[PDB]
Design a protein around this ligand. Structure first.
Ligand SMILES: *Cc1c(COP(=O)(O)O)cnc(C)c1O
Ligand SMILES: *Cc1c(COP(=O)(O)O)cnc(C)c1O
Lengths: 394, 392
């Protein structure tokens, strides 16, 4: 008899529909529409010219390596560089095809159908999507400008032992929250206090607007002796998101598992991409970082000064200290889906908060990104938003 | 703490003969017949350095910026043109290795029955195993999968899908003749079954004509149950990790949705580079490889007919890049692996190629990396180690 795909599929097929966060992210990007949706890094920072140069030099001088199957752990020097950067040995670094893959790997080796997974609400759609594929039970705690609610977390931890906690300490997506050094130390003790695994996504490590970067769960934990933290770093927010080159740092025991999972995922991360990324960070990484901080800091200050003028104070909006997000909250009882369609009529866009909630929620919240627009688009965008934002209040 | 923290999937991934025993086949001076690496001589060094340098310069903003999962439109159209289908039916992945990971994730649940030959591509076993399926294997030979043993399985079991490599299967090199394909398709259409067709070796036939693909016989028949997998790893570069999946629209979406959770999208730099290199004289490039493997394969068999004892058999591949050897039952290929080192030569023991164990008296031989002398020299050392084993 005929083929009914809908039933030919397995269970996982239904745990990744992703059909509403696609139709809604599509309605935008039309004619003259300024958008604050999507997390596309600032394009002007892409190092074209020297990427072109490094790529040719690489393919021409070592083409029989960049084009040949390569080790799964990753390109040797790249690993050395990441180790020397983070502060660990090469054998503790696994190059991945973006943090998105590492997330997927993490889920494959840690989650089982029904398993307990702890993360924040809201959180990164990437982790949610990847994890959801393993049909776990999502345990959550709300997150605010001071990071995750550590108390709420204590009562959830005493009631159940989650396979691991997925945190985003530095400038969490989508709130843009920052977890203070104190909270981080408390959160570390709660973890060592129960031998729990912590997955630290530090994609925005270097996007701190302040005069310095607060240490990480990985650092704090490593300088204690505890190896239950898995550090996930990426180059998608400092170099290029398209190259798809990231890494995962962890204790050998777990590392081993990720490597074998990785292998079955795509054999290995493209070699060119790995060598390319290296040939750009071995030269002036410090000033490159320095150069990116200023760019986002600038767009941030601009995003805020415009929000303060056009946005009535009946609605709250975070004040980002790093990263590329502004988490907005409409008064209770009001919807973002409504604000969204009101906004499109004013030719502006954002992402309703809903999809950032593992178990659903944030019906009155929404995320705003300011990393892809101009100090004029930013401003022109906020004018329109707050305009529609004003048309919804009634 | 750690082991008491993982999950079922962590046990279905123990990478043994892949990232453990492959370090011994590396030392000082030992010719290796292990590992299926494509010939490096075919790699377009200068043409790629030019295309790449130009992509980063002229259109580097789309090359380095996040891209919609599916893939560089021009590459999908090119692939669509090549395979004989449309751009919307094509999905670009990070190597076929991924498509096998995306299929496992979409059709398999713990317990799910999957059918694939025994032996078959380790990559596929690995990709699937992670799901906890139940493997139904059918013996594979010079003519392909044992269709009788197969119909005898379709009469009891109903696999979520059948995984087959009709053209120069890894590791045997067997080639399924058109009639056998016609039969096989007749069997899955009669039962509305899914078939994942892996054509990594589509273009590597030493003859002068490629055989109709299961995707081709099917599309022509009207049946949409085939998911055609294709790669660029054996005809351009394996390290670029650029491949594709051609399937029915409704099955493609789920694969697309699965891919985003995997790596978001395939590096766009790589996709554009591949397209840049193939919009020009593809046919000639294909003939150059067809020649090199044909050329290396003839040298491989010759060295074998001149060195291997008669009490041991090996396949005579009509395409591909492998030669599958089988010692007389009872004799270990893993033991041989020890007398092979004494002789400074190596190969891949067959065990890992059997989804459900067994066949420990067989092993795979790859030659694509060696050249005329390595072939002859290695087959001479392998031929010697064999005499040792046949020396009781
Ligand atoms: C942008 C982002 C990443 C980067 O993902 P990649 O797959 O490495 O490109 C990872 N985590 C978070 C929270 C992000 O916002
Ligand atoms: C080489 C090969 C592939 C190609 O895998 P990639 O991920 O594209 O490098 C797929 N299937 C088989 C049987 C192969 O031998």
């Amino acid at each position: 008899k005929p083929l009914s795909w809908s039933e030919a599929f397995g269970k996982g097929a239904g745990r990744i529909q992703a059909s509403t966060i696609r139709e809604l992210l599509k309605l935008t990007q039309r004619p003259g529409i300024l958008s604050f949706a999507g997390g596309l890094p600032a394009p002007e920072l892409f190092p074209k010219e020297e990427a072109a140069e490094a790529a040719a030099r690489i393919l021409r001088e070592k083409g029989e390596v960049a084009l040949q199957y390569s080790p799964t752990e990753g390109y040797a020097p790249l690993r050395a560089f990441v180790a020397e950067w983070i502060g660990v040995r090469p054998e503790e670094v696994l190059i991945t095809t973006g943090s998105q893959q590492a997330l997927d790997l993490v889920g494959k080796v840690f989650l089982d159908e029904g398993s307990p997974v702890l993360l924040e609400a809201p959180s990164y759609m990437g982790a949610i999507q990847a994890f959801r594929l393993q049909g776990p039970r999502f345990l959550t705690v709300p997150a605010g400008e001071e990071g995750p609610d550590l108390d709420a977390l204590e009562e959830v931890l005493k009631r159940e032992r989650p396979r691991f906690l997925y945190l985003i300490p530095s400038f969490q997506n989508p709130t843009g929250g920052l977890t203070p050094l104190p909270a981080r130390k408390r959160l570390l003790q709660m973890v060592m206090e129960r031998g729990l695994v912590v997955v630290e996504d530090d994609a925005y490590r270097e996007l701190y607007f302040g005069e310095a970067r607060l240490p990480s769960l990985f650092e704090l934990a490593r300088e204690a002796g505890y190896p239950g933290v898995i550090y996930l770093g990426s180059f998608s927010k400092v170099l290029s998101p398209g190259l798809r080159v990231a890494f995962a740092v962890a204790h050998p025991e777990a590392l081993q598992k990720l490597v074998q999972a990785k292998q079955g995922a795509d054999l290995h991360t493209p070699m060119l991409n790995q060598m390319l990324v290296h040939e750009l960070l071995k030269e002036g990484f410090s000033e490159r970082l320095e150069r990116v901080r200023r760019v986002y800091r600038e767009k941030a200050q601009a995003m805020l000064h415009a929000l303060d003028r056009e946005v009535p104070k009946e609605v709250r909006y975070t004040r980002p200290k790093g990263g590329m997000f502004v988490w907005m909250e409409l008064p209770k009882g009001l919807s973002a889906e409504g604000l969204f369609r009101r906004a499109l009529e004013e030719n502006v866009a954002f992402v309703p908060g809903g999809p950032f909630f593992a178990n659903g929620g944030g019906e009155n919240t929404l995320r705003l990104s300011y990393a892809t627009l101009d100090r004029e688009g930013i401003a022109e965008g906020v004018r329109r938003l707050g305009r529609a934002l004003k048309g919804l209040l009634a």
